[PDB]
Amino acid sequence: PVDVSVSIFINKIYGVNTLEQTYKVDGYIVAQWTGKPRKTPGDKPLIVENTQIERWINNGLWVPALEFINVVGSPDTGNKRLMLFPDGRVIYNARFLGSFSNDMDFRLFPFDRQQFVLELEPFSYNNQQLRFSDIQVYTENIDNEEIDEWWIRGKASTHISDIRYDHLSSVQPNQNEFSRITVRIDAVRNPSYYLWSFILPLGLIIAASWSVFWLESFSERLQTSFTLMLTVVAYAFYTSNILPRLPYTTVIDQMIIAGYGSIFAAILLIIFAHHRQANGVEDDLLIQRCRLAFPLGFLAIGCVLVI
Amino acid sequence: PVDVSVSIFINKIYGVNTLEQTYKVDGYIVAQWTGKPRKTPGDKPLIVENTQIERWINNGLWVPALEFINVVGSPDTGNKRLMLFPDGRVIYNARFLGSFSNDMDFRLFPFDRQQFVLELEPFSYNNQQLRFSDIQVYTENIDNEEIDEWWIRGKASTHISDIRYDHLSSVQPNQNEFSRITVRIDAVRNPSYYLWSFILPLGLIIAASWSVFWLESFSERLQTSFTLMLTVVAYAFYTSNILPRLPYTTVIDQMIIAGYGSIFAAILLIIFAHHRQANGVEDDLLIQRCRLAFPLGFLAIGCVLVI
Amino acid sequence: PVDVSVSIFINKIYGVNTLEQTYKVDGYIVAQWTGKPRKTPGDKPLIVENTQIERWINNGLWVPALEFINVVGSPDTGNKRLMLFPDGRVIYNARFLGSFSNDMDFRLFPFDRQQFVLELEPFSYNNQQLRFSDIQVYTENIDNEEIDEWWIRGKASTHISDIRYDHLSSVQPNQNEFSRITVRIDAVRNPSYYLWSFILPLGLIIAASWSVFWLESFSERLQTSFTLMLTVVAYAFYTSNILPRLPYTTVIDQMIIAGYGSIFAAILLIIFAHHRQANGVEDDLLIQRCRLAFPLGFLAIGCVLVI
Amino acid sequence: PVDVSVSIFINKIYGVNTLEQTYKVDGYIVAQWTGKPRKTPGDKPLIVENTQIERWINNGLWVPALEFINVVGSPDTGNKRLMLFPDGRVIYNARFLGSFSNDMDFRLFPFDRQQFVLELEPFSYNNQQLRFSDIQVYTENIDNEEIDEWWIRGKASTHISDIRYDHLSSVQPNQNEFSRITVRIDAVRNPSYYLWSFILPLGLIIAASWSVFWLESFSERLQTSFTLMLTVVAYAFYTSNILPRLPYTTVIDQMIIAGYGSIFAAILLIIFAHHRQANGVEDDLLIQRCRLAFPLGFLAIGCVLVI
Amino acid sequence: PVDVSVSIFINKIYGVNTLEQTYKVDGYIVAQWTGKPRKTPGDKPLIVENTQIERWINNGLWVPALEFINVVGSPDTGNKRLMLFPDGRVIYNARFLGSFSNDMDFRLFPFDRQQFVLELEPFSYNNQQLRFSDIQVYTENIDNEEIDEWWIRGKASTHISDIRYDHLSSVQPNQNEFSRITVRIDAVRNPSYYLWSFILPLGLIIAASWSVFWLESFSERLQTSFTLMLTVVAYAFYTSNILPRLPYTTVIDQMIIAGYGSIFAAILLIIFAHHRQANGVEDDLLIQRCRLAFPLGFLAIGCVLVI
Ligand SMILES: CCN(CC)CCN1C(=O)CN=C(c2ccccc2F)c2cc(Br)ccc21
Ligand SMILES: CCN(CC)CCN1C(=O)CN=C(c2ccccc2F)c2cc(Br)ccc21
Ligand SMILES: CCN(CC)CCN1C(=O)CN=C(c2ccccc2F)c2cc(Br)ccc21
Ligand SMILES: CCN(CC)CCN1C(=O)CN=C(c2ccccc2F)c2cc(Br)ccc21
Ligand SMILES: CCN(CC)CCN1C(=O)CN=C(c2ccccc2F)c2cc(Br)ccc21
């Protein structure tokens, strides 16, 4: 079993695709394994760059193909390097950029708790042929959190484990176990933009929506709630066009539904106040003065949604 | 006839293009055929990776080109592997990512019933030269349905059949039959977002649209229906900008037309009530109180749309 | 002159770019020419796939480069195949995906009549060196027209002609004629979405725009036309955002201009009714009742759009 | 000094990127230079296509790399051709598609005057090594101007000049001059869409904005100007979403600012008319009837904007 | 230690991605190092272009891989050139286009201060193997500042430094230092578009928002502020759709929040004026005439935001 020491150097985690549950990762892979001793020019370790690496493999150099399990398609591999030592150790260094996938929950947006995962595994050689000895990640990202979209919390979580495939029958009997490196980087979304530019103005719309009961005439009370309805429609459109596309409702999306409900409940109460009478224009002095009845009731219903 | 055993491993089905009727599929193809016995180093099966596969074909290795019939262009092929056994059998393993096409009906959106199809067929060799012995699909997708956009129902449906091409005249007479693998994965769309953020608020708009008949003055009844008209225009824009682009009307699209119709029917009645008179301001004592006449009449028209 | 028999197999015509006048075509090219007799293994025709085709050309195989005249850049060529026969005939089969250009008129949108053209011509060899013997197209597209964006009407139109280039002076004197295959597939756009979701609601906006004259007060008649103006602005935005981008006005675009004109003509007449008086509040009992004068005048302008 | 005769064949100029100041050009490059006499099969000129061109260079064929100075990145090169003559002359023919850059002014949009420039220069060989003998452009574009976005005015402007680089010190002393071909194609933008769908309706908005003074009550005069303000906001959004993104204001953008100003000037005058009094509601007869004072005054300010 | 002289020629800095903190840079890299003296044909320096460069490396030419540290993925390399001199010196010239990353603060938008950075470093050879002797940048960009999106201040700031990597343990002990070239081009954003098309009209919206107190009736004062609220919602949407996407609020974004606050403060004051009474309709003659109280108070709060 060939012992391979891996080292991942994370440079940038960007471009989060909410619908595809994808994120772009730029970095470097450093794989090291000790092979048969070589006769390098002089005695110092020989360096093999990009094109020449392929030429050495053709001659007989064993360079194992290590695949990213969670990568979407094939990653953009930059500069390649092979450092061949006279004692036998071979070091493979290459820059990479790939789109990685992971199960991502954006239900409690914009207060997300997401972890960026990286999964490495040899494509052809099993645990008895190729084994991952040790792995260390270097996230050289520090300071200027208020400028970046995401706030990296942990240093990096690593786990080397043997993955067993079910496959059913096939040609390989017992040899069905592969060593896999799992890298996890926990992060929290910056809600400073969404709180001030989306939560705060929406809150004022719903608050001003309750000020419709302070009107004197029934015609005034009803016609204003139609403008109020149009304001939430105009805001729902403003939200959905800028906010990320998702197959489920978020906290901001739920606030919009609560806004529509608040206006529709007001529409029903304004009609009920004027028509549930004993003469014709007998507006219930208590139900017309619900200026404090459901506005605090909205806070009660709003806190039920949190539970 | 060379018997080839195929095995498809589905990893992710994402990125549904509604207009192009396309979907992205990430997975692995495993093709196995038994050839002439080889002399592998030692006696254990020899592994050939990526670049070296092309070198072996140049020497004389028969690797048949198996084409994806329903793929859009050329797929992104990842790591390639050739496992050559001393007994003869050859196993080809390669990761793939391609955009696949299939006839997709999105008429009853967001309650769609779609099946993701995969079609494999040899590009050059016919059924008498190359035959597909057996095929098995492994959809290792389970749990977290409420997070994913689509809900995979069935395990995977397979069908190996001989496809005969019409062509007319040409050079090949009887040899015009090819073995084809057809993989079908049935799925249902998650309507939780579209029901709460699009169906539910739209329903409230139409419900509040009928509350225009609770107004006393004709001037009030007419001017409010113009604001109501503008609300549906603002909503129709909010819908079409977020909803997928299609060459036919959906359930949500039909609801919008019903909204325009309900306001236009009101506009005609509000004019008729005030102008069809015996004195001048004689608003037909019963037609003006149609606060329950067409709102349930809309539901009756809404039940006719079920047919 | 080498006689080459071509056969095009159309799979999918999609992705129409209105501004660039481009459309994506997926299919197969089958070129056949009779050469010098060969000694194939055994006696059965030899099959050469992808990578190996390039190896045969290096040895001395003549494979002519046939260029798509109307293609935008270079097309995505899939699997390649060379079928070499012992009698001499050579068959080249390859899957292709390319963006093709043609003069496209979208003036009478959404009732467009467009033809998808394909132009094939040898890149280096003239009509005296390479001649196209015959060409046949196979459009294996049938049923489910209501699901597809475009409705293919004609089966396929083909034309082999000799194209003469002007060039002026140069090195080649008489040899300036090349054989060209021109494939034409006529299609009609599906107007079901645009008629119900764009033509029908817009018609109701203009129809409800003429209901402004049924108002009693001049203040009511003027203030409502400002809301009417805002409704067309909101609709013009809804139209232009979803509708394809073009450097000329369509039928739907012309309808929007007619809407703006109808409201502006109303604004002028409402002012003219109130102020062309003999006291101050002398509103013309016939011009204020133009409730039928210009609404049918709009229909007369609509009939002028036909001429 | 090698004399090279170049011939550019323009097929299509499309996809103008206003922010990047880029445009896509599809065509053919024909370069001719006389070399040492060759022994071609028979005596007729030998044709070398695509892959085989690289093989001939490896043997010792001198094919100079001619770079497009104003191209953005690397262009999409189609079919390549080398016509080797027994007398010595070598003709290089290749199809190209590239994104070209040029200093573009879109200040007086949609009535822009833009010229599409193409710059060719040898990448390695200077004017003493490689000289451009002559250049001729063939713009085979004619008729259907009303369908195309841009209207080509001139045939083609060509200029061969020696460009001297400053560089400072370096290794090359006197040898710092390179021959450069500059191709210029002048074109005027089709304003038919922008005049009818953007200039004309905007003009009606500002014209109807002045009709706010024809209202009787001060409350009516003020509340209507708020709807007028909202109409320009809705139009400014409709304009900016469809119109190209630029780092400077256009004629249409300036018209929008003039619209905001006209409404804000009206707001100030309506307040001043009512509050600058001697009793309370002493609305200045002349200042309230400014229905003709600033509407023509706007035309006077509008004429200053042109001159 | 090999002394390498580098020269960067900047052609265009465009396409600033605010969310990814990326910018596209087009230019040329000129690397020079003195090797072992060669024997070139004749005596003049030998030129090696594109494909042939790879052929020379295979034979034994040492061409070091110089990587762009801050580049996003792999850059689009154009034409490549190797000028081999008989005295020994080797000059590598190649055109490049890459997306470069740098820490970018867009908090005080549109009055941003940014610097475009370029970082070069050898991928395999350390400071003891490869050393950067000198670096000079040529920004041939001058005049037409009012047309370009950015105004460049300096010529080009350069800094050659030895970067030491932490790595921890590994195989390399002392040899962990690499020479790095840092290029900085300081720039200031052109705010002429954003000041006239976004700051100026928004200022008029807030200024006209304070004109709601000039209304006589309480019903008029309240209903108009709802239209005012809808105007800011329509403007907030117009702003966010055109303005760049960022994870933090800008000066323009803060102005929008101030607009919502000004209307909400007015809503509370209009309700307080009418309901805080001694009879019923006792509107406080001073608090209703706050037509000058908070409008200048808004300017005071506005001046605090600047500090
Ligand atoms: C020769 C026996 N073979 C079973 C077909 C070994 C296990 N195997 C494969 O050969 C095909 N490739 C893989 C495989 C190997 C590495 C990474 C991803 C894979 F799908 C595989 C996958 C699963 Br799930 C189950 C078995 C499996
Ligand atoms: C020599 C075998 N040949 C008869 C001439 C098979 C028929 N054929 C082609 O040769 C071109 N290529 C194909 C073809 C073959 C395999 C896969 C996809 C193809 F388009 C083809 C397509 C159709 Br539809 C009808 C016939 C057909
Ligand atoms: C050697 C003859 N040559 C003189 C330079 C003229 C033929 N020619 C070309 O060699 C470049 N390619 C083409 C050409 C060849 C095949 C298909 C399309 C083309 F534009 C061409 C086009 C025109 Br228009 C005029 C000349 C012409
Ligand atoms: C060969 C000697 N050399 C000086 C080291 C010539 C000058 N030169 C270059 O070598 C790099 N390439 C080029 C050069 C040549 C052709 C096309 C584009 C280029 F940047 C160049 C550009 C400028 Br500005 C100034 C000098 C210059
Ligand atoms: C054998 C010593 N080893 C240290 C782990 C080599 C140095 N190295 C790499 O091989 C991986 N690539 C790099 C590296 C090399 C060139 C440019 C950027 C890099 F991250 C690197 C980065 C850091 Br931080 C630390 C070590 C380091």
Side-chain angles (χ1 to χ4, degrees), chain D residues 67 69 121-125 163-169 173 178 180, chain E residues 7 9 11 27-32 45 47 81 83 85 89 91-95 138 140:
Chain D
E67 199 193 61
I69 297 297
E121 196 187 287
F123 191 73
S124 313
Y125 311 100
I163 269 77
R164 196 203 281 103
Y165 294 106
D166 301 77
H167 68 267
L168 206 133
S169 64
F178 288 83
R180 186 193 283 187
Chain E
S7 296
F9 296 89
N11 299 316
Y28 299 88
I29 320 134
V30 184
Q32 186 176 147
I47 286 153
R81 187 204 83 186
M83 210 185 186
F85 283 78
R89 62 193 186 204
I91 304 172
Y92 179 84
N93 181 217
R95 191 170 178 176
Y138 302 89
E140 294 154 299

Side-chain angles (χ1 to χ4, degrees), chain E residues 1-141 143-169 173 177-307:
Chain E
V2 181
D3 290 290
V4 173
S5 180
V6 184
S7 296
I8 312 292
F9 296 89
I10 309 288
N11 299 316
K12 194 182 168 76
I13 304 162
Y14 70 101
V16 178
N17 192 307
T18 46
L19 244 167
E20 286 185 5
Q21 287 169 65
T22 311
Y23 46 94
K24 289 180 179 176
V25 178
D26 179 74
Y28 299 88
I29 320 134
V30 184
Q32 186 176 147
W33 62 92
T34 313
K36 314 294 160 190
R38 236 157 268 94
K39 185 75 188 180
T40 57
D43 207 85
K44 286 206 184 178
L46 205 265
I47 286 153
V48 182
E49 285 183 323
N50 307 301
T51 316
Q52 301 303 291
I53 283 139
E54 199 194 288
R55 270 194 71 219
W56 274 81
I57 294 155
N58 281 32
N59 296 328
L61 220 174
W62 176 77
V63 181
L66 305 161
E67 199 193 62
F68 282 116
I69 296 298
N70 62 317
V71 81
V72 179
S74 59
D76 183 6
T77 317
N79 278 275
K80 290 175 184 181
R81 187 204 83 186
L82 266 184
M83 210 185 186
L84 300 152
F85 283 78
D87 62 273
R89 62 193 186 204
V90 183
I91 304 172
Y92 179 84
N93 181 217
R95 191 170 178 176
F96 77 97
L97 175 73
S99 287
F100 296 90
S101 188
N102 183 45
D103 292 286
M104 292 160 109
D105 180 286
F106 303 102
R107 295 198 207 190
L108 44 143
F109 180 89
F111 317 105
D112 300 310
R113 298 278 278 261
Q114 243 78 69
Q115 51 162 45
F116 308 109
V117 186
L118 260 95
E119 290 181 287
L120 240 175
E121 196 187 288
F123 191 74
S124 313
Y125 311 100
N126 78 117
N127 69 332
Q128 288 179 276
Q129 284 172 301
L130 209 149
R131 195 194 158 264
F132 287 134
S133 58
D134 61 271
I135 204 274
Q136 42 268 306
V137 194
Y138 302 89
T139 56
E140 294 154 299
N141 313 338
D143 307 315
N144 309 300
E145 277 180 288
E146 281 173 79
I147 277 302
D148 301 317
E149 200 187 354
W150 293 85
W151 309 330
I152 309 302
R153 297 279 81 160
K155 196 80 243 287
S157 188
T158 35
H159 183 28
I160 306 159
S161 54
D162 285 50
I163 268 77
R164 196 203 280 103
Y165 293 106
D166 301 77
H167 68 267
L168 206 134
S169 64
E177 224 161 73
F178 288 82
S179 57
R180 186 193 283 187
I181 286 160
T182 319
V183 174
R184 288 183 177 94
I185 305 146
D186 279 289
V188 192
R189 200 182 279 271
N190 179 11
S192 59
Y193 176 75
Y194 307 101
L195 267 153
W196 288 90
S197 283
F198 282 93
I199 299 288
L200 202 135
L202 191 269
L204 299 165
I205 309 293
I206 327 299
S209 169
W210 312 320
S211 78
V212 77
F213 297 102
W214 264 277
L215 283 151
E216 306 298 300
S217 182
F218 159 73
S219 300
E220 288 168 15
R221 272 144 66 201
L222 204 99
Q223 282 177 274
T224 305
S225 33
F226 283 100
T227 310
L228 241 0
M229 194 72 142
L230 194 264
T231 312
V232 168
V233 172
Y235 200 92
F237 196 3
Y238 156 72
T239 308
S240 295
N241 184 257
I242 311 306
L243 251 76
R245 276 83 183 165
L246 281 154
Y248 45 89
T249 56
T250 66
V251 183
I252 312 166
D253 283 297
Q254 277 168 80
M255 266 192 178
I256 295 291
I257 323 304
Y260 282 116
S262 183
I263 295 159
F264 195 76
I267 282 280
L268 292 161
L269 278 154
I270 288 156
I271 286 155
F272 191 81
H274 193 253
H275 288 266
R276 175 53 57 241
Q277 36 66 42
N279 47 71
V281 208
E282 188 259 294
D283 290 81
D284 301 66
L285 219 85
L286 285 147
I287 227 139
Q288 70 179 277
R289 217 215 292 169
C290 67
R291 299 168 183 173
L292 214 102
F294 81 59
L296 67 88
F298 187 90
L299 261 85
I301 291 156
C303 284
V304 166
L305 283 144
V306 181
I307 310 150

Side-chain angles (χ1 to χ4, degrees), chain C residues 121 123 165 167, chain D residues 9 28 30 81 91 93 140:
Chain C
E121 197 187 287
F123 191 73
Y165 294 105
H167 68 267
Chain D
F9 296 90
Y28 299 88
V30 184
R81 187 204 84 186
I91 305 172
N93 181 48
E140 294 154 298

Side-chain angles (χ1 to χ4, degrees), chain A residues 96-107:
Chain A
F96 76 97
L97 175 74
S99 288
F100 296 90
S101 188
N102 183 45
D103 293 287
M104 291 160 109
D105 180 287
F106 303 102
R107 295 198 206 192

Side-chain angles (χ1 to χ4, degrees), chain A residues 67 69 121-124 165-169 173 178, chain B residues 7 9 28 30 32 81 83 85 91 93 138 140:
Chain A
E67 199 193 62
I69 296 298
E121 197 188 288
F123 191 73
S124 313
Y165 294 106
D166 301 77
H167 67 267
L168 206 134
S169 64
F178 288 82
Chain B
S7 296
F9 296 90
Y28 299 88
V30 184
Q32 186 176 147
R81 187 204 84 186
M83 210 185 186
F85 283 78
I91 305 172
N93 181 48
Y138 302 90
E140 293 154 299

Side-chain angles (χ1 to χ4, degrees), chain C residues 222 226 271, chain D residues 207-217 220-226 228 262-263 266-267 270 288 291 294:
Chain C
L222 203 99
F226 283 100
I271 286 155
Chain D
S209 169
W210 312 320
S211 78
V212 77
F213 297 102
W214 265 278
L215 283 151
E216 306 297 299
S217 181
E220 288 168 15
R221 272 144 67 201
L222 204 99
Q223 282 177 274
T224 305
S225 33
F226 283 100
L228 241 0
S262 183
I263 295 159
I267 282 280
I270 288 156
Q288 69 178 291
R291 304 170 179 184
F294 83 58

Side-chain angles (χ1 to χ4, degrees), chain C residues 148-164:
Chain C
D148 301 317
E149 198 191 358
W150 289 89
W151 299 335
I152 303 298
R153 292 295 186 205
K155 187 94 256 285
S157 187
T158 37
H159 181 50
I160 306 158
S161 54
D162 284 50
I163 268 77
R164 199 189 286 104

